Design a protein around this ligand. Sequence first.
Ligand SMILES: *[C@@H]1O[C@H](CO)[C@@H](O[C@@H]2O[C@H](CO)[C@@H](O[C@@H]3O[C@H](CO[C@H]4O[C@H](CO)[C@@H](O)[C@H](O)[C@@H]4O)[C@@H](O)[C@H](O[C@H]4O[C@H](CO[C@@H]5O[C@H](CO)[C@@H](O)[C@H](O)[C@@H]5O)[C@@H](O)[C@H](O)[C@@H]4O)[C@@H]3O)[C@H](O)[C@H]2NC(C)=O)[C@H](O)[C@H]1NC(C)=O
Ligand SMILES: O=C(N[C@@H](Cc1ccccc1)P(=O)(O)C[C@H](Cc1cc(-c2ccccc2)no1)C(=O)N[C@@H](Cc1ccc(O)cc1)C(=O)O)OCc1ccccc1
Ligand SMILES: *[C@@H]1O[C@H](CO)[C@@H](O)[C@H](O)[C@H]1NC(C)=O
Ligand SMILES: *[C@@H]1O[C@H](CO)[C@@H](O)[C@H](O)[C@H]1NC(C)=O
Ligand SMILES: [Zn+2]
Length: 598
Amino acid sequence: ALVKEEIQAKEYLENLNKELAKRTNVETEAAWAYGSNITDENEKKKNEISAELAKFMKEVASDTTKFQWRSYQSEDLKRQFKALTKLGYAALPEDDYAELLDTLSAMESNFAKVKVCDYKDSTKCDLALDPEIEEVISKSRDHEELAYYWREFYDKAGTAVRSQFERYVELNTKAAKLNNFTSGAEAWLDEYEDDTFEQQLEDIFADIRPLYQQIHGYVRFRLRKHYGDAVVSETGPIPMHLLGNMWAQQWSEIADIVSPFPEKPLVDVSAEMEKQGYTPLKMFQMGDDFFTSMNLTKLPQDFWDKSIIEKPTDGRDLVCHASAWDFYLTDDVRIKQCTRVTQDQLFTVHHELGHIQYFLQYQHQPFVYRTGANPGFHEAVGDVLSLSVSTPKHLEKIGLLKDYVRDDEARINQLFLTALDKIVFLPFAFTMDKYRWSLFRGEVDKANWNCAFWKLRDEYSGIEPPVVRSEKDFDAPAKYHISADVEYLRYLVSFIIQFQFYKSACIKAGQYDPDNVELPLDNCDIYGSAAAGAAFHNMLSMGASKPWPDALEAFNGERIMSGKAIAEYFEPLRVWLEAENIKNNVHIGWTTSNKCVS
Ligand SMILES: *[C@@H]1O[C@H](CO)[C@@H](O[C@@H]2O[C@H](CO)[C@@H](O[C@@H]3O[C@H](CO[C@H]4O[C@H](CO)[C@@H](O)[C@H](O)[C@@H]4O)[C@@H](O)[C@H](O[C@H]4O[C@H](CO[C@@H]5O[C@H](CO)[C@@H](O)[C@H](O)[C@@H]5O)[C@@H](O)[C@H](O)[C@@H]4O)[C@@H]3O)[C@H](O)[C@H]2NC(C)=O)[C@H](O)[C@H]1NC(C)=O
Ligand SMILES: O=C(N[C@@H](Cc1ccccc1)P(=O)(O)C[C@H](Cc1cc(-c2ccccc2)no1)C(=O)N[C@@H](Cc1ccc(O)cc1)C(=O)O)OCc1ccccc1
Ligand SMILES: *[C@@H]1O[C@H](CO)[C@@H](O)[C@H](O)[C@H]1NC(C)=O
Ligand SMILES: *[C@@H]1O[C@H](CO)[C@@H](O)[C@H](O)[C@H]1NC(C)=O
Ligand SMILES: [Zn+2]
């Protein structure tokens, strides 16, 4: 009978989950050691442990077939079994899997070890993306210096790993097919448990695109005044090196030159942070307080004892790209961040602690449920906090923003500043996976791989490289997530749903009322709101125990991903900006780039 078997299956899963947690802990420790300290020895060990765990998961997947799990009464038991049948890369033959792991570490270590020569001193060649090159990209307003660093970085982080990247695409596809997905794209998209999810994102992106065009237009207008028409054309894509960021994913670093009201306050608290003697530790402590102020969980002692919150000053190599780690025990959670004392880094700290909070909130769950309701939820949690941290309201409370008058013009400056990060990023994030999906699905010949990348960056974002690229270059792996094989759609989803979360949390905190000019959504601070916190607790404690619409329902009673909340946030900006572009006769739209030669 199935009644007796379903009772046995329940005990089988209970023991197996605990075993998976314990085995993954060993892999996670080895991965943590590699990322904190990149050596051939640590690579070998990371990859050998993973291979062992891969082998064990194969065995588990095979063992699921001895249970009639699809026949069971429990949706919960069925959901857990379904999770165990999904092997990912672990479906590959032993040798193929090992080759893949060597390929991935080759790519991530290459990215992490990139060094460029100083623009002004080619004897000094120890400049790393983080912090040296990123400091320049964000601060320099010398367009030739900007273009020099762009070309050096992209040549070393991108083109250098073309053949490894090709091999990864093959093995990624092979793995997906061994799981009976058409490609890696369907493998990634499976995490969202919704067969119309791509179309949903297309619909939502289409609604926000006109606002992005207006922002793009206005920024291009303002850059022309700064750099002149020789550097920036009216009708062409924006030279991406002028946008304050190596990938042009967010443009807030050039707010000083494109802000709507240059003679009104622009929030940039980096200087005050330094003046008040802030450290990385202080920044994490403040993030902690934010979470505990909402009646959420305080960081445990293991976090403080084991996290790395500053770039090491010994000679070593490591992955500085920030990350949050769950070791699947109790309270062993850590962050690795090469923290700097700046405004953007304060937001990052809160973002990462959102990951840590999710880990702590679902650690009581069975292992297979110890992850986000979908990858987007995990990325959204901390960003909901960063939105209120970013408000003048909050920055005044913590004494980082002084003598701030919030008149109508300063409001527009702050809305635009936020848009430069929140709206600008949407097309960027969409293209990161549109590109990889197209490679995974076999839609682009290998001979056209680099111009397929720049073509998407043009079509959706209206940016282009500073210099002519060709199919001799290979520019995509210059983005961390592309070198490190991290699905990027999570972030598009996060930037949409975080405003659904933020809006609802602000309403619960009494911080937003649409019909009250004193409680605007763009100045809501949820700090200290236990109502807000309760919503977070209800959602986050579920982990992946239910499909994501049930997790959203737990937060605010909604079950649909919607662009309504983000549009609602920026509606005051849209009205103002549309009128400002008309007043200044701003050209909108762009010609096709001439920057990637076939
Ligand atoms: C991805 O899709 C793949 C298909 O495209 C799929 O691969 C198939 O998985 C099947 C197992 O689910 C497998 O079916 C078995 O076939 C055996 C012999 O087939 C040979 O010939 C093939 C044709 O050329 C070769 O290609 C193969 O290499 C094979 O050598 C059968 O002997 C076998 O049977 C036994 O099992 C069934 C299943 O029983 C189930 O459970 C209970 C049993 O207790 C039943 O009561 C219940 O009703 C249910 O049926 C028994 O019914 C039967 O009595 C035997 O005991 C079985 O049918 C198939 O061979 C395989 N490949 C292909 C190409 O077809 C992958 O599994 C998919 N991957 C993932 C990750 O999902
Ligand atoms: O550590 C991660 N993820 C990190 C990436 C990563 C994935 C896999 C392995 C290693 C690392 P991140 O996105 O926190 C690491 C960071 C976060 C960040 C940066 C910023 C930020 C703020 C101001 C300026 C520039 C950046 N804000 O937040 C990240 O990857 N951010 C994205 C995009 C992003 C930008 C802004 C933002 O608000 C949110 C996201 C990027 O850098 O491209 O894992 C989370 C996790 C773990 C287990 C299960 C589910 C989820
Ligand atoms: C880095 O790992 C190596 C193993 O290759 C080890 O010998 C060394 O102790 C580690 N270095 C640091 C600074 O932790
Ligand atoms: C904190 O959480 C508890 C239960 O976890 C809840 O009952 C209580 O309302 C919360 N604290 C406050 C001040 O609301
Ligand atoms: Zn993240």
